[PDB]
């Protein structure tokens, strides 16, 4: 099999931290505590495309 985070023909969320750090994550899994879904079910390409546009600043809410 292939790894679920590199599935390509797979369904994904984009989670975000309390520190606004983004995480790609497959829809079948049990969503972890302290993460909220900002990008509803989608393909990997458009999920990856979301992270480029929306993360931008990678600092973990020290100043940001």
């Amino acid at each position: 099999s292939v790894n679920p985070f590199d599935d390509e023909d797979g369904e994904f969320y984009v989670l975000v931290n309390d520190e606004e750090q983004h995480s790609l994550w497959p829809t079948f899994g049990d969503v972890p505590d302290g993460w909220r879904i900002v990008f509803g079910p989608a393909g990997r390409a458009e999920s990856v495309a979301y992270v480029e546009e929306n993360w931008t600043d990678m600092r973990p809410k020290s100043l940001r």
Partner: protein
């Protein structure tokens, strides 16, 4: 406290007079107090030049005491230190500095700077916390560019304040690993945060013998050693580790035999198998070897570090049960912030942790692991194509990308190979780029052939058309008998007479082998040839006999050039055993268009003695196994691959002529057939005739004749009589194993492959002749070993179409490229020089092998087993 300066300040507070830093010489040494003040002076100097909080400082420096001071000075200024190897090529250094775009760039010139002016007190600054960056380090990236891992203060403190370091084992530590590699994080901070001494090894590459000296002479108590370099030093210099208490060995899989050399029942020296990627801060797991009983043949990576959390997970992100394989994910406080300037790749690899604290994240290693019976984690290889070479983490895609962007190269694959000695290294297989419409070397390729032919023909007397200079067999290196060469020539003459030729143009006339028998009973016989010595010989020869003096014309010009030749005058253009000396497919296409303009309506181009590309590999394996019968199957395939690329003659697949004929609407018929006769040589076995007729010829359409396979449908020649009766005379027999190639194989000693019961094309024609049929034999598009035979009621109508039938879409490679054969031999050298100027030395592969095509599997993916050995 939650920063490195704050914890370092606690050490200097207790032990200001204790030794902190020792030089490579052994003569100079700095105390904690002296190192603190020295680092403070650098921190003030950095502040003067504009370095503040959350800034990046590039340290383009060799391994030294000044570098240890500089990293402390950088951290004391609230900044983030980024080591850059000064022995890297300037292309790589400028690439990292561009991606980083740092606030400041320190180099060797920091030593020359006068620091005595600045104060020796703390800089104070804005308050730094745990989540602020300590350093950046660059790993190999799969895309092409390198990716910098952003590491924080608490990540370093997670590693550095593990309870395992709370003892006297790291009193004197050797600092020898490169600053760019993250083992340096262990080497610096473990002793510096516990009152120990950092013994700085000298700059550059240090072999096993040179480390063995320093370990013993400096009085080293603790060590990092890569698994490969650990194996060499422990084999040859086991006496060096007498005063050593702890050795942390890892990077690659650790040799159990190597550990057993050092570890004893008393347990004064302990060896630790240290696992961890860069993204989890040096060490994620550890397995301690105190006694030799612990050294197993599996060599487990062991249990987690204090700050680490190890999850063996399946394809659905659930925890795997005991003794079952899963992919390793590393949680805990060692997990890095992410990759610098790559948010999607960070979100891909640094993922949400379902087992740890709510906010926390989990790094995806891509390492296969398993919990054993004893409860220790084992390492079981790797999921993706990542591999380690001489300690360094290498992603093959980084190599592929650098190769792929060069001029004469289309594709590339890079794989590891274990040599006869034992050490792992890289080999890059590359295929060259094939531009349409020739290259600069195309004209130079023709001029070399001209120079060869001029030297052959000039000087070196006889009659017209009866001389065969001497052709040698590729199998034996002996001469081909002149009886076989006469029959070869007479088959071409018979075919021209059969077409009822009157006005002939022979391109590449030569010494006049065809001119002699054909010109006497012809209305006109024109002959072009690019070698002037032959034209002048023939012009003297035809001058003597006045019968063909008025008829014959002899021009000295290239086949490509149409200048001065009659337009729509001739009824046949001969290209017999000349096409092979052309540089490329575009040149062949151009000369055929020229030859087509020569023909009046109804005429034809006769292309004879064409080298078959479909059976080139079976020809060359036969020649090689004949000349070198002792060579193994792998050595043959390696030798044949070179022979294909080094071939100086042009070799054309039959599909070229069908593809050529579709664009040309004037060409109404294409007759492709095998060579006739029972002679057993390379000419008869691997060459063929092509006839291309013009618009008003009216051919026999043999493309849509009802077919039958040899193996399946019609078992034997008795069944053929039955099948020809049912189908009513018209039947084409397919998938017939070519007996000519079977005979070639047994004589040369090749294993080969085909089905049972081969037929000789000549015997099949003779068999058909007895039963009142004409058998038209041709190549099989399905297989090289097979051939097709179209059986029709006998007649003298020399004008056929669609004897050869293509099967499936196969224009992958119609012709080879002899003009580029010299550039192909220069590529292995040239690409090594190109990658050495761009990349670090470990990324440059050992050997670069060229191939005309990458061997693919049946499904589509790359077939690694077929790739030739070096």
């Amino acid at each position: 406290v939650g920063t490195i300066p704050e914890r370092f300040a606690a050490v200097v507070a207790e032990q200001p007079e204790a030794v902190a830093l020792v030089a490579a010489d052994g003569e100079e040494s700095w105390t904690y107090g002296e190192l603190d003040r020295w680092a403070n002076r650098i921190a003030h100097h950095l502040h003067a030049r504009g370095v503040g909080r959350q800034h990046r400082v590039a340290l383009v420096m060799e391994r030294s005491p000044l570098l240890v001071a500089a990293v402390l000075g950088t951290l004391k200024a609230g900044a983030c230190y980024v080591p850059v190897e000064p022995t890297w090529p300037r292309a790589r250094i400028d690439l990292v500095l561009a991606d980083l775009d740092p606030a400041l760039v320190i180099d060797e010139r920091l030593a020359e700077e006068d620091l005595t002016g600045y104060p020796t007190r703390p800089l104070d600054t804005a308050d730094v916390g745990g989540e602020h960056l300590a350093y950046l380090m660059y790993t190999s990236g799969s895309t092409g560019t390198p990716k910098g891992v952003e590491v924080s203060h608490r990540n370093v403190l997670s590693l550095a304040l593990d309870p395992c370091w709370a003892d006297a084992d790291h009193q004197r530590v050797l600092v020898h690993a490169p600053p760019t590699f993250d083992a340096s994080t262990y080497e610096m901070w473990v002793p510096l945060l516990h009152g120990g001494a950092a013994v700085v090894a000298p700059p550059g590459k240090l072999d096993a013998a040179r480390l063995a000296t320093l370990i013993a002479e400096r009085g080293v108590t603790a060590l990092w050693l890569p698994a490969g370099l650990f194996d060499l030093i422990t084999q040859h210099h086991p006496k060096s580790f007498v005063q050593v208490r702890e050795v942390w060995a890892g990077g690659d899989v650790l040799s159990p035999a190597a550990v057993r050399r050092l570890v004893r029942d008393d347990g004064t020296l302990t060896v630790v198998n240290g696992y961890g990627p860069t993204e989890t801060t040096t060490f994620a797991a550890r397995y301690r070897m105190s006694a030799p009983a612990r050294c197993k043949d599996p060599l487990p990576i062991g249990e987690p570090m204090a700050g680490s959390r190890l999850y063996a997970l399946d394809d659905r992100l659930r925890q795997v049960p005991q003794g079952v394989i899963g992919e390793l994910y590393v949680g805990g406080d060692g997990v890095a912030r992410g990759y610098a300037n790559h948010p999607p790749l960070t979100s891909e690899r640094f993922v949400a942790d379902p087992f740890g604290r709510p906010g926390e994240r989990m790094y995806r290693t891509g390492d296969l692991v398993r919990w054993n019976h004893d409860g220790q984690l084992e390492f079981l290889g790797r999921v993706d194509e990542q591999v380690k070479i001489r300690g360094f983490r290498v992603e093959p895609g980084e190599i592929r990308a650098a190769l792929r962007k060069r001029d004469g190269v289309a594709q590339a694959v890079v794989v590891p190979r274990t040599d006869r000695l034992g050490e792992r290294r890289l080999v890059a297989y590359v295929v060259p780029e094939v531009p349409a419409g020739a290259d600069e070397d195309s004209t130079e390729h023709v001029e070399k052939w001209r120079a060869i032919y001029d030297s052959m023909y000039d000087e070196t007397a006889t009659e017209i058309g009866n001389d065969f200079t001497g052709w040698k067999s590729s199998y034996t290196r002996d001469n081909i008998p002149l009886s076989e060469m006469r029959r070869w020539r007479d088959s071409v003459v018979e075919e021209v007479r059969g077409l009822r030729a009157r006005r002939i143009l022979e391109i590449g006339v030569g010494s006049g082998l065809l001119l002699g028998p054909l010109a006497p009973e012809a209305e006109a016989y024109w002959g072009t040839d690019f070698s002037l010595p032959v034209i002048e010989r023939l012009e003297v020869q035809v001058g003597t006999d006045p019968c063909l003096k008025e008829k014959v014309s002899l021009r000295c010009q290239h086949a490509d050039v149409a200048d001065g030749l009659p337009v729509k005058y001739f009824d046949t253009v001969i290209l017999n055993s000349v096409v092979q000396y052309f540089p490329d497919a575009a040149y062949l296409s151009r000369v055929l268009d020229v030859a087509l303009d020569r023909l009046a309506p109804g005429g034809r181009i006769l292309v004879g003695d064409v080298r078959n590309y479909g059976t080139l590999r079976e020809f060359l394996t036969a020649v090689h196994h004949a000349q070198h019968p002792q060579d193994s199957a792998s050595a043959v395939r390696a030798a044949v691959e070179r022979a294909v690329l080094a071939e100086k003659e042009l070799v054309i697949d039959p599909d070229f002529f069908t593809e050529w004929a579709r664009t040309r609407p004037d060409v109404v018929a294409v007759d492709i057939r095998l060579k006739p006769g029972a002679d057993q040589n390379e000419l008869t076995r691997h060459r063929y005739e092509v006839i291309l007729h013009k618009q008003p010829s009216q051919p026999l359409r043999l493309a849509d004749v009802r077919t039958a396979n040899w193996g399946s449908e019609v078992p034997d020649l008795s069944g053929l009589e039955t099948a020809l009766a049912r189908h009513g005379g018209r039947l084409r027999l397919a998938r017939i194993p070519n007996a000519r190639l079977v005979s070639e194989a047994v004589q040369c000693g090749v294993p080969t492959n085909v089905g049972g019961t081969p037929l000789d094309p000549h015997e099949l024609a003779s068999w058909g002749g007895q039963r009142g049929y004409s058998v038209h034999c041709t190549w099989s598009a399905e297989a090289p070993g097979w051939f097709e035979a179209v059986i029709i009621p006998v007649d003298s109508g020399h004008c056929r179409d669609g004897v050869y039938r293509p099967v499936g879409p196969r224009p992958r490679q119609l012709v080879n490229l002899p003009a580029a054969a010299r550039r192909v031999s220069r590529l292995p050298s040239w690409l090594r020089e190109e990658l050495a100027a761009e990349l670090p030395e470990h990324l440059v592969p050992g050997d670069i092998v060229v191939m005309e095509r990458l061997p693919l599997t049946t499904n589509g993916k790359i077939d690694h087993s077929r790739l030739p050995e070096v």
